[PDB]
Design a protein around this nucleic acid. Sequence first.
DNA 1: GTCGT
DNA 2: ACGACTACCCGCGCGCCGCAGACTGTCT
DNA 3: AGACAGTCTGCGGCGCGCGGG
Length: 1011
Amino acid sequence: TAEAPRINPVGIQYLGESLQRQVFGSCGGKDEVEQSDKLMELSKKSLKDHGLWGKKTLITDPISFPLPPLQGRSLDEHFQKIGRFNSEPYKSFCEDKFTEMVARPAEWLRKPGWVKYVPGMAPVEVAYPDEELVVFDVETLYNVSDYPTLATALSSTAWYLWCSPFICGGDDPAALIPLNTLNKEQVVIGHNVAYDRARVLEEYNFRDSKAFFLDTQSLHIASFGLCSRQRPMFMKNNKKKEAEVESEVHPEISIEDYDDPWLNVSALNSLKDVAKFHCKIDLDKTDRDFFASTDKSTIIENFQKLVNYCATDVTATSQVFDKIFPVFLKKCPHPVSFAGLKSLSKCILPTKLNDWNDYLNSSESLYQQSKVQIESKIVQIIKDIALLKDKPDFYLKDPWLSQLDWTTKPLRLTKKGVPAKCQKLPGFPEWYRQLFPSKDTVEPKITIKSRIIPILFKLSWENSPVIWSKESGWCFNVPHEQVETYKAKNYVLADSVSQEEEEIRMNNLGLQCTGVLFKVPHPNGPTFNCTNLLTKSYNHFFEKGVLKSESELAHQALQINSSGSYWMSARERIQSQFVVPNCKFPNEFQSLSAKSSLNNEKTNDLAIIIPKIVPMGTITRRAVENTWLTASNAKANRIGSELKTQVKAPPGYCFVGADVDSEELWIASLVGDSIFNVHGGTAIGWMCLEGTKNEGTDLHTKTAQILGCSRNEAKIFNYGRIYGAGAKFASQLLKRFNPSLTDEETKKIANKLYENTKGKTKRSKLFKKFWYGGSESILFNKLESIAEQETPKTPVLGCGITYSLMKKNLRANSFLPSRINWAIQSSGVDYLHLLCCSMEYIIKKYNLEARLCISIHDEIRFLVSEKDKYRAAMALQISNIWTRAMFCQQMGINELPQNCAFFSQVDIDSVIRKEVNMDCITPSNKTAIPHGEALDINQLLDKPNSKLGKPSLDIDSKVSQYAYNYREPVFEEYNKSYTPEFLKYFLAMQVQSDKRDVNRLEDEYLRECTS
DNA sequence: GTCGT
DNA sequence: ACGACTACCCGCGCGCCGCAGACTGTCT
DNA sequence: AGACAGTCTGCGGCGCGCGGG
Ligand SMILES: Nc1ncnc2c1ncn2[C@H]1C[C@H](O)[C@@H](COP(=O)(O)OP(=O)(O)OP(=O)(O)O)O1
Ligand SMILES: *P(=O)(O)OC[C@@H]1CC[C@H](n2cc(C)c(=O)[nH]c2=O)O1
Ligand SMILES: [Mg+2]
């Protein structure tokens, strides 16, 4: 009756026969049986050492449902043909591009709209250029409005100029540039092209577009990338440039280029630096000042020079692209990369105008009131203190007040006249005078972040006033008889120089001296000093009675800081967004579906925001957004944290979204398990694959119960260990999570956890230094082994590394921890590209009404009508299983576990939030939001409308034309170098747990080598 | 790239 | 001089130091 | 009636801590 589960030697489930046939086809192995016997004995020893042999795992019923068929005999052929289908039209336009440039017109004309100039003929007026490929540039005035002012375009046969009606006679500055994007397929090349895309008229539609905007900055960051090592390497480049500019003679190859050949590899991302590095062109940026004016009559003059400057920028961009493009084509030869690059450039954000304005007003109105209410009282306190000038004894017999500078400057007297020498507050103490910046200032300036805040307040650490020392920071005084006693609680003595400084400071006031000075502890360590006392770290110490105040203002200050830090950080970015309403452009906001189907209300308000996304702005080739990839989540106390809830779907539509579970951990486990050619060969892989999230048995949750912390903190703890964190930092993090623990406990727990995870180290001559005896030793050794290759490539697709981080350019400096993370963090991007390609292929094939809305890292959302929601979820599941199967096949394994095949949850909602069940209550927002829906695979299958429907026959016919070429995987050519006996003896030494075993196996290997 | 034995 | 080291992004506020710039007071 | 040498008086760039994903 029921199908029997299929289980490999270790207790893990695989896919059913139906899914096996529909995904992997007919594949057989058993070629390496003789090697697999010895490998299985070694794996048996490794698993029995850690007590994981014969342990129970989760087993469920098989899952069977019909998938769409594949287009090849292997996954690689299928993905290549789909990528060629999806990137065929525009890539032919990218090649055969013109290399010669036509001449410029002698004189330009000021007419509203689009004017075409062809050399040898009279200029004409056109509605739109109607060209396959153009180079584009836009200029706007940013102090009057956000709308464009003029535009220039170049093609292979003519020049095009666009002029706004605002500068040709008129008072309405709202206008947009038309390009007929909804009907004509075209490629537009530019530098930071998203800013230019935001000013196009036909981009403000819910219906999809047919234009491809390409950026040269991403192409420069990918190949010939800037170092971007998050290192002083950026400072190193700047100081080299300063030194080279300073000295006419440049013997660079003599000293600094010999030690650091990386210096002459790349430059900065700006257009000036990129153009200067790639070509011998010098550009001028002065003319930008002409666009900083408020009046428009200045733009009427100097028309010719501004237009010529725009044309020069266009020419420079054209030459830069012509130089860069083939190198990027050589570095990334797979079509899926280009398809994903095209796909990641069409984001859109629906909003509403009035709600946006109300949200902004509420946030600002709360923030300013909260700031002013606490800033009012400190001035009164200062004015109360300031009347003690006449009597010295009060402030000379007080502990806190005696650390101020009370010296007064005498009144100057020029001969026979008033001084009038720009004096500031004559006959006043120095600390009072220092508050006022200028003569015009009448009210003192003070914030809660000023240095003298503890002195103005009365702050005590264990009933001892705080003292400021220039060398060490904040300190407190301990009597002699207890100096040893306070050393029992891990209090570090201050530096000696501070001791003499305190000695003379007291001696100037007499009072002899008692005790020594200890330092207030700092969370990062004993070496770092303390300079602030109202941060998050000292909030805990305000409770439990360690830090105490004689005034009621400190706790309020802590509340206000914690409530307003994020809004203070992000207010300028948030308030400057460009929002376009429906009232101004009544012929553009067209529905995604072809049929209108009414759904019209009494003048409803809608708006669209186009994000400024740079597709490839990282060495690991991730995307960059300054505002929308850094948005905070909703919190009860935090002000203005409901930003992402402002994205609302129009009536009759919804959002469908998904997020990937434990991506890089799974990738690392697969890389570790690839050696034994079995799932669960290593201990870490068996621990990772034995549980799943829906029953609360995943690795992060288990670490959370072992360490007694949250899952988010456990993620940081687990990733830090993998990416190279020491045991001391781990103990510091453990104390950070639980601040009521002693240092000794954290040290023993950290050492015990690190000993089990990583074994001892063995150093030899013929074999280099390696770890042994640990559960993850093989994974680590494989990480440095692949990091030390001559030509590193991503294991799945085969993308090369940037020239800055290559071995030959790095002579002395190494940057190893940045070289190790690169492969995993780039596979994380290959995953997203494959997902996007699969989803958009399915959307084209089955005629679904959907469009990509937003793509945060490892999280994707789509805007879908009411009818086709479950079909979109189904397509998401199919894309996920195809991507995982491709990753498994590229490593040399033709099997897939059942537990990790599908998404845990799929979210259907009307707004963007982390969880569908959140209420999103903030101090700014007093209204709850209704909950959404979340579904897993079985409940999705139970739905009646989950089925796809009938396909289109012509799509497969078009796809079948493209060609396929066989390529060898990268790990095979890596393995070609090493001899088999070397690998077997090395792994046999790695699986041992004792030094004598390693020595005797090394001796046997040496004897075999001699024999 | 940067800092201790 | 060798070995050990969480990784990739974004940005605001406060203290410090190097220079323009105005005010006299002899000095011519 | 200038010449110029001190003599203060701010103003701007830099860097590093401190927070968000
Ligand atoms: N401190 C960190 N250090 C290094 N990498 C991190 C760190 N935090 C997050 N990441 C990495 C790992 C992830 O691939 C990715 C973050 O995506 P994320 O979804 O939050 O983690 P996750 O997918 O493993 O958990 P979950 O299953 O809950 O989604 O970047
Ligand atoms: P936020 O919702 O917290 O994070 C979403 C994405 C996932 C990946 C990226 N990211 C976040 C954090 C906190 C990190 O340390 N590293 C990341 O890459 O932000
Ligand atoms: Mg995730």
